[PDB]
């Protein structure tokens, strides 16, 4: 019992920490090019801002599945029930 | 697990999704196909007018 409970605290840290690492670097790559394109054509900013939020939905797609399975492991536990 | 509860929940969600697609995804596709239907009609009609072209024999 103690090993499954202790190894699920670390499984939650890997699920949220690797998602945090990827989402923070992915928005630095996408947002750096949004500020560079907004300097190139400042009249197209409204259009580029909508196209950036469409891509933001694609970055935070697999990260929200992992942040949702990681909150499921802290308030419920599918492994503990398996003894 | 209330199997009946699951069915009711899925049914409500599906109804909302169908409503969205019917009032959001259906209008653009029917409009696009009907516009093509009109372009073809204009093109065929214009050819018929071109068919009615005559040259004066003077």
């Amino acid at each position: 019992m103690e090993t499954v409970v202790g190894l699920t605290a670390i499984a939650v840290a890997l699920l949220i920490g690797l998602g945090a690492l990827g989402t923070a670097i992915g928005f630095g790559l996408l947002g750096g090019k949004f500020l560079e394109g907004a300097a190139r054509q400042p009249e197209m900013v409204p259009m580029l801002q909508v196209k950036m939020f469409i891509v933001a939905g694609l970055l935070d797609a697999v990260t929200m599945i992992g942040v949702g399975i990681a909150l499921f492991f802290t308030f419920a536990n599918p492994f503990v029930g398996q003894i | 697990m209330n199997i009946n509860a699951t069915l009711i929940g899925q049914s409500v969600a599906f109804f909302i999704f169908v409503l969205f697609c019917m009032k959001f995804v259906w209008p653009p596709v029917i409009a696009a196909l009907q516009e093509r239907q009109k372009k073809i009609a204009d093109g065929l009609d214009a050819a018929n007018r071109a068919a009615r072209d005559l040259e004066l024999a003077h």
């Binding site: 797609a61 599945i65 029930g81 | 697990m1 209330n2 199997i3 509860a5 699951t6 069915l7 009711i8 929940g9 899925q10 049914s11 409500v12 969600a13 599906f14 909302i16 999704f17 969205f20 697609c21 995804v25 196909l33 093509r36 239907q37 073809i40 009609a41 065929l44």
Partner: protein
Amino acid sequence: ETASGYIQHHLQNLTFGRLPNGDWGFAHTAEQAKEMGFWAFHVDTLGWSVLLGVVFLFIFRLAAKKATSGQPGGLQNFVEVMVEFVDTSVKDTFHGRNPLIAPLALTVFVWIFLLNLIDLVPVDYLPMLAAKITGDEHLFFRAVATTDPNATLGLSISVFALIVFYSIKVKGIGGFLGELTLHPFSSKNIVVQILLIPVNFLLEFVTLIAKPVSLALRLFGNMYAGELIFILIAVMFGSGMFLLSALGVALNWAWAVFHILIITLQAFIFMMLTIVYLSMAHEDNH
């Protein structure tokens, strides 16, 4: 009943095998199904895939058999849009004269789209109606055909048979084996060429075998995750709590709206990879 039991029931296909009980025989439990040999068919998956294949083929034949040449009717207008789109996609990717590539691309795109379309309806509507019609409240039944590895492998292995067939038909048997051993690296002298033939085969054979496996798993992956997330969202309502049910309906709608992109992209990408892979069996790239 426990939620682990509901999820484990949903992840089982309707299987058939010639058991000693009688000529006709079906699996009544998960263990009894897994115990059978490779000579047992998933009847639900063959049933839905053949049915939707015939539906696609029938609605297109209803238009093709009475094509007006001039002004098109409501159905013919839609059928022409699909043919025009596929022919454009083929002509932009392939420069040859093969008459099989366009009918194949249209068939592959519309069939795979319809096999995935039956996933948008509530996941336990069809299984309960199938159970009630059959008279067995504990029957296994899965509607979505692409969530079974066998359906996606059947599509890719069949495309691979055409890729190998056309490659041998135009390059010749000796030429085809030649592409796998004489390219990309070659030399003016035999002593260096003999040292390059294992390197050539190690690059070409690996990159050739990954084509059927990638097509199947790319189609299976997104679809299997999609059906499984709907089964998990359905368990959320089973708890009976009002706030948890309100979250479940909002997530189900958001996931279904996101899935309208996935259903379209996987069908389109399988079509494009099919056209591209066949187009490179009629040309040379080393």
